[PDB]
Structure formats: structure tokens, C-alpha cells
């Protein structure tokens, strides 16, 4: 069912993203299901919501290489063009695939151009996309990278200049991840980690059996408290796992309870348990939901939907006004609902707020003898 546009965007993501559900379905199953959602779109008033969350999900999926089917993923752009989405929305969507294609060519051009040397050449991938279209947050999450990865920054940077001048790269480490080798005392494993997790774990490299406090990790990592808290939590409390990679001091049930003095240490007995028997070797993905949507990002997305609404309502009202020079509130509301028809449905409260804003800004004015009827002026 899912009437709510956002539930519908999440659902779509659950099908286009590598997920337990995405795995339990064939192309055809997925495909048909993606269409039985777009169909239900013609009954959604606030279409701008689905469009914005769908695009936000698509962004993570392409930036993180987590599409279940490059095919289905791309064919979705036409499926949207069919159900009637605007050519402008659909077109910027198609623009994102182009951007990725352009990014992957630039990836190789780098991998070969640089067979000469920090790391085994090919083991390093890069993705460089335009900010205006791939950035969704104005917030920047900083992280001090371990030398073993910082020596790459200047490499990738020079390569980009002689290719494109007058440009500047902004590292989006929150969206960076990789694989590392954890050499225990029971074995050695390959952990699919988040770059922030990486930075955190590498803090013990010249002090393997040392305990480090939260505060000191914050100094060595330079992560903002919020991020550091959840990153650390994913390492001392990865769900369902029987043995955590990291151990901490006063026990808690929430990363909120960590304090300056909480001590962390590398568990020298970490191991994967395949067949109830310790495994001296193996591979695990500890990224979890660390690179997926957060509550904060949601408030950000909604603020964006609200910004565009207000702007689009102001333009629509003036426009209707720049046509009739005098109109009744009743009449304004209804032919205004029509122009915003394919985006959302403004509520009376917002309209009054805008109209109100328009009066004090001298674009319109109420009638001399009528608290309603508005008169265009200027």
C-alpha cells in the first residue's frame, strides 16, 4: 500500500539497493515490483517528496556501488519518464549515470597512468563527481587519515589538475570505504570497513595492546563526536557477531553513554566462527548501516522540500497575479493548486503565509473593501 511518498522512495531503494530483499528476487520480480510502485505515484499529492528521496537514495547507491542491477537501475529512468515525471527531474537523473561513466573512465586513466609508485596500484579506486549534483549536505565531516592513505591524496590531486584546470576536490570520506587486514593473535582477517572505521582502528598500529580513551581517539581521529560515537559502537558492538574486533571499558547499551574516560582496546582474540569452530582466516563486512541515511540527513531533505515549496508557491502566486490583476482568495487557491499539480499540494496555512509575505513585500495588496480579493501591484 504505502500511501506516504517517502515510504515509497525507501521501498524503491530497498529493491534497487543490494539488500536481503534485492537478493530474494529475479530481475523480472524486481522490475514488475518497481512498476507497481510508480503506478501508485499518480495518486500521491506530494510527488516532490518521492522525487527527492528517490534521488537521494540513488545517489548513495551509485556513490557506494550498491546497485543490485546496473540494468534495472538505469531502466528506472525511463520507467519514470513514462509515469509522467518531469523531463527535468528525469533528465538530471540520467545525468548522474553519465557522471558515473565519466568517473570510471577517469578511474582507470588513473590506475594505469599510475602503475609506478603507498599501495598495490589496482587496489585503489577513485570516484570524482560534481558537488552540485552529488552533494546533499552542507555539513562536512572531517577525518584525519592515517599516513598510509594520506600519501594518496596528493597523488590523486595532481592527476586531476592536468586533466581539468580551475577545479578543487573536496574529500567526502564519509562515503569512502575499503578492505583492511587485521592481524590478530588467532589469525588474520579481511575486514570490509568504512574509512572512519579505518581511521579509528589504525590508531592502535604503533601500540597494538594499548588501551586508548574516547577523548584520545577523538584527538587521533579528529572525527566529530557524533560520528566517532557510532563508528566506535560498530566496532565494539557489531550486532549478532559473537566476537567484537574492539573492546571497551565501562560497558553501556548506547554510544550515548560513552564518556571521555571510556577505554578501548584491540581484542587480541578476535576471530570469525564458521562451524562453531574458531577460524584462523576469513572475511567480514563491518560497514553495516554506517553509510546509509541518518535522521539528520532526513531533516536536511525535508528542509529542502520546504525551501522549494515556498519558492514554487511564491512564483505560482505572482504568475497567476501577473495574469488576473484582481482575484478572490477562493479562486487563487484553486488555480494555484493546478499549477503545482505535479509537484505537491500547498495547504491553506502555507498559502496564507506566502500571500501574507507577498503583501508586506509589496507585490500584492488586499482589496479596499474585502478582506479577501487580492490586487496585483507592481
Partner 1 sequence: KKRFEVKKWNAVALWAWDIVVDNCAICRNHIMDLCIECQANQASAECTVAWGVCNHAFHFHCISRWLKTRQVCPLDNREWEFQKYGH
- The residue ranges that bind partner 1 (CB under 8 A) are 63, 65, 92, 95, 119, 123-136, 138, 148-149, 152, 156, 160, 164-173, 175-184, 190, 195, 198, 201-202, 204-206, 208, 266, 303-304, 307-308, 311, 360-362
Does residue 139 sit in helix, strand or coil?
coil
Residue linked to cell 507592481? 378
Residue 176 backbone phi and psi in degrees, to 5: -110, 140
Q: In this complex, which beta carbon is closest to partner 1, that of residue 2 or of residue 188?
A: 188
Q: In this complex, which beta carbon is closest to partner 1, that of residue 294 or of residue 331?
A: 294
Instruction: Compute CA distances 129 → 103, 104, 124, 167, 276, whole Å.
Output: 7, 10, 17, 12, 45
In the complex, least distance from residue 36 CB atom to partner 1, rounded to whole angstroms: 30
In the complex, least distance from residue 94 CB atom to partner 1, rounded to whole angstroms: 12
In the complex, least distance from residue 35 CB atom to partner 1, rounded to whole angstroms: 28
Q: In this complex, which beta carbon is closest to partner 1, that of residue 29 or of residue 148?
A: 148
Q: In this complex, which beta carbon is closest to partner 1, that of residue 260 or of residue 303?
A: 303
Question: How many CB atoms are located within 10 Å of the residue 34 CB?
Answer: 20
Q: In this complex, which beta carbon is closest to partner 1, that of residue 38 or of residue 173?
A: 173
DSSP state, residue 344: -
Question: How many CB atoms are located within 10 Å of the residue 198 CB?
Answer: 23
Instruction: Compute CA distances 31 → 42, 47, 68, 71, 363, whole Å.
Output: 18, 21, 12, 10, 49
**Which three three-digit cell numbers place residue 58?**
540513488
In the complex, least distance from residue 195 CB atom to partner 1, rounded to whole angstroms: 8
In the complex, least distance from residue 285 CB atom to partner 1, rounded to whole angstroms: 13
Inter-residue contact 247 to 267 (CB < 8 Å): yes
d(CA 338, CA 343): 10
Nearest CA to 291 among 202, 227, 224? 227
Q: In this complex, which beta carbon is closest to partner 1, that of residue 95 or of residue 326?
A: 95
Is the four-CA dihedral 65, 66, 70, 76 of positive or negative sign? negative
In the complex, least distance from residue 209 CB atom to partner 1, rounded to whole angstroms: 9
In the complex, least distance from residue 291 CB atom to partner 1, rounded to whole angstroms: 10
Run of H or E residues at 56: helix 47-63
Q: In this complex, which beta carbon is closest to partner 1, that of residue 149 or of residue 223?
A: 149
Length of the chain in residues, anyone? 378
Q: In this complex, which beta carbon is closest to partner 1, that of residue 52 or of residue 230?
A: 52
Q: In this complex, which beta carbon is closest to partner 1, that of residue 34 or of residue 49?
A: 49
Residue linked to cell 564458521? 274
Q: Between vectors from CA 156 to CA 150 and to CA 161, what angle results, nearest 5°? A: 135
Does residue 278 sit in helix, strand or coil?
strand
In the complex, least distance from residue 40 CB atom to partner 1, rounded to whole angstroms: 26
d(CA 146, CA 276): 35
In the complex, least distance from residue 271 CB atom to partner 1, rounded to whole angstroms: 14
Amino acid at each position: 500500500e504505502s500511501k506516504c511518498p517517502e515510504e515509497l522512495a525507501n521501498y524503491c531503494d530497498m529493491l534497487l539497493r543490494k539488500t536481503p530483499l534485492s537478493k530474494k528476487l529475479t530481475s523480472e520480480e524486481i522490475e514488475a515490483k518497481l512498476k507497481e510502485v510508480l503506478k501508485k505515484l499518480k495518486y500521491v499529492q506530494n510527488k516532490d517528496v518521492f522525487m527527492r528521496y528517490h534521488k537521494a537514495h540513488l545517489t548513495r547507491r551509485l556513490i557506494l556501488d550498491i546497485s543490485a542491477d546496473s540494468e534495472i537501475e538505469e531502466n528506472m529512468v525511463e520507467w519514470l519518464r513514462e509515469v509522467g515525471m518531469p523531463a527535468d527531474y528525469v533528465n538530471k537523473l540520467a545525468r548522474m549515470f553519465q557522471d558515473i561513466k565519466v568517473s570510471e573512465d577517469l578511474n582507470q586513466a588513473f590506475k594505469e597512468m599510475h602503475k609506478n609508485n603507498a599501495l598495490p596500484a589496482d587496489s585503489v579506486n577513485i570516484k570524482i563527481l560534481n558537488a552540485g549534483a552529488w552533494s546533499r549536505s552542507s555539513e562536512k565531516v572531517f577525518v584525519s587519515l592515517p599516513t598510509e592513505l594520506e600519501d594518496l591524496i596528493p597523488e590523486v590531486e595532481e592527476f586531476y589538475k592536468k586533466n581539468h584546470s580551475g577545479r578543487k576536490l573536496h574529500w567526502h570520506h564519509l562515503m569512502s570505504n575499503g578492505i583492511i587486514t587485521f592481524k590478530n593473535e588467532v589469525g588474520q582477517y579481511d575486514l570490509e570497513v568504512t574509512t572512519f572505521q579505518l581511521a579509528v582502528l589504525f590508531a592502535w598500529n604503533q601500540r597494538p595492546r594499548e588501551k586508548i580513551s574516547f577523548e584520545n581517539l577523538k584527538l587521533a581521529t579528529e572525527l566529530p563526536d557524533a560520528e566517532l560515537r557510532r563508528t566506535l559502537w560498530s566496532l565494539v558492538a557489531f550486532p549478532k557477531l559473537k566476537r567484537q574486533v574492539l573492546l571497551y571499558e565501562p560497558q553501556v547499551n548506547s554510544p550515548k553513554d560513552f564518556t571521555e574516560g571510556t577505554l578501548f582496546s584491540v581484542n587480541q582474540e578476535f576471530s570469525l566462527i564458521k562451524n562453531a569452530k574458531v577460524q584462523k582466516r576469513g572475511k567480514i563486512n563491518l560497514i553495516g548501516r554506517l553509510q546509509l541515511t541518518t535522521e539528520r540527513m532526513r531533516e536536511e531533505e525535508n528542509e529542502g522540500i520546504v525551501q522549494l515549496r515556498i519558492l514554487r508557491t511564491q512564483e505560482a502566486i505572482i504568475q497567476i497575479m501577473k495574469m488576473r490583476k484582481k482575484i478572490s482568495n477562493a479562486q487563487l487557491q484553486t488555480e494555484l493548486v493546478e499549477i503545482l499539480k505535479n509537484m505537491f499540494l500547498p495547504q491553506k496555512k502555507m498559502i496564507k503565509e506566502q500571500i501574507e509575505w507577498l503583501i508586506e513585500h509589496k507585490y500584492i495588496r488586499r482589496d479596499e473593501s474585502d478582506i479577501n480579493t487580492f490586487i496585483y501591484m507592481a
